[PDB]
Design an enzyme around this catalytic site. Sequence first.
Site, PDB file in Angstrom:
ATOM      1  N   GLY A  93       4.330  26.559  12.897  1.00  0.00           N
ATOM      2  CA  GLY A  93       4.866  27.912  12.917  1.00  0.00           C
ATOM      3  C   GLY A  93       6.216  27.955  13.592  1.00  0.00           C
ATOM      4  N   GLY A  94       6.256  28.655  14.722  1.00  0.00           N
ATOM      5  CA  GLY A  94       7.437  28.762  15.558  1.00  0.00           C
ATOM      6  C   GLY A  94       8.084  30.107  15.310  1.00  0.00           C
ATOM      7  N   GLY A 112       0.820  -1.210   0.000  1.00  0.00           N
ATOM      8  CA  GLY A 112       0.000   0.000   0.000  1.00  0.00           C
ATOM      9  C   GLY A 112       0.847   1.249   0.000  1.00  0.00           C
ATOM     10  CB  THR A 113       0.186   4.780  -0.039  1.00  0.00           C
ATOM     11  OG1 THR A 113       0.170   4.637  -1.468  1.00  0.00           O
ATOM     12  CG2 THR A 113       0.791   6.085   0.341  1.00  0.00           C
ATOM     13  CG  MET A 127       6.981  29.618  24.204  1.00  0.00           C
ATOM     14  SD  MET A 127       7.263  30.162  22.511  1.00  0.00           S
ATOM     15  CE  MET A 127       6.022  31.428  22.258  1.00  0.00           C
ATOM     16  CD  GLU A 166       7.144  31.331  18.926  1.00  0.00           C
ATOM     17  OE1 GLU A 166       7.040  30.093  18.994  1.00  0.00           O
ATOM     18  OE2 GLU A 166       8.179  31.950  19.245  1.00  0.00           O
ATOM     19  CG  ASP A 226      14.663  31.683  24.057  1.00  0.00           C
ATOM     20  OD1 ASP A 226      15.656  31.049  24.489  1.00  0.00           O
ATOM     21  OD2 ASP A 226      13.944  31.238  23.150  1.00  0.00           O
TER      22      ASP A 226
END
Length: 388
Positions: free
Chosen positions: A94-95, A67-68, A202, A136, A205
């Site tokens: 995204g990010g 199959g696939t 988050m 973001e 950073d």
Amino acid sequence: TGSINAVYFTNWGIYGRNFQPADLQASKILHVLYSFMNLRVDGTVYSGDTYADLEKHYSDDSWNDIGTNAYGCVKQLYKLKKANRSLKIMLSIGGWTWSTNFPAAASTEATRATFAKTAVEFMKDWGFDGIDVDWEYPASETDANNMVLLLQRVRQELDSYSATYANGYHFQLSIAAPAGPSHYNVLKLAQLGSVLDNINLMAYDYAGSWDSVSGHQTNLYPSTSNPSSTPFSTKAAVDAYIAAGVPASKIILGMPIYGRAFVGTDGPGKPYSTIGEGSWESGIWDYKVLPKAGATVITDSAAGATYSYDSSSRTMISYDTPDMVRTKVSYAKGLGLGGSMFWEASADKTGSDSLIGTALSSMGSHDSTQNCLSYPNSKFDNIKNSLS
């Protein structure tokens, strides 16, 4: 029952970092944030690396399956799902690097529908348990309302998809959220709290090359003794989200599995020469290589932060030690946060010095929310057959 322990796993970790899905501590993770998908201005979500996502054959994988079929990290993560029923796989879109098409993607009737449709297509084909959206960051009031609209549309699509194909399994929807007030003050935080399963803060950073002085990148609290060392704090963000009416139990506290360096510095809140070298990019070190010989680990308990400092090279590295993770978990428990989150998998130590492990140990038991192992509408034969 239990707590969230969510972990970013990057599809590019499979190359130089040589970190494959099977190396995850799958029994200690409730959410793998599988990162990242890209997106077009018209809302179309697409794979940024089909080899990593679906084509790479591990030694267990055959070239002539009927199959696939799916391979790559997709099949590897599904295998883990089967053996660990509390392990949910989230499709992260995204990010920081791929957020420039989000405003347009969220902008219209049409673009938002396309986003929802394309994103759920991947989730249902690949055998994932939800979608994590990492815009973001929304800039305008228009963006902020468009974000609610978009997540609502994605929510609608998950609910409809599940009704037809998953017997009402509650697929999940989450975001990566800003800890910086310039970004979070733009968000419709209450409405976000209402529509989402989880908001992954988050809380990292906070300091880097863009600062004139060295700082803590992930401190719990402002430093009153040395304010220049703490341009942000998790406390300020968490308070702002709770005050806004986001349920505490939906806020998941993000933590770094890496250090941000300041080379040629007297200590926190001081001029530095350069961010210096890193493990994979300038100024950033994998947690698994820290602390380095010649550096002493320092705990600032008032600011709620750890860092290594080498007096000889005048090098400061802002990162979380195992005890720092324990201290954060303790803070989160006092507010009733939903659990922990980490960027990213590959950098962690093994055994008890694992940050992911230390988190779960401190949190207690692991989120009992089962995953889904039924994907009848998958275009991939092996996934619709649950690899049986």
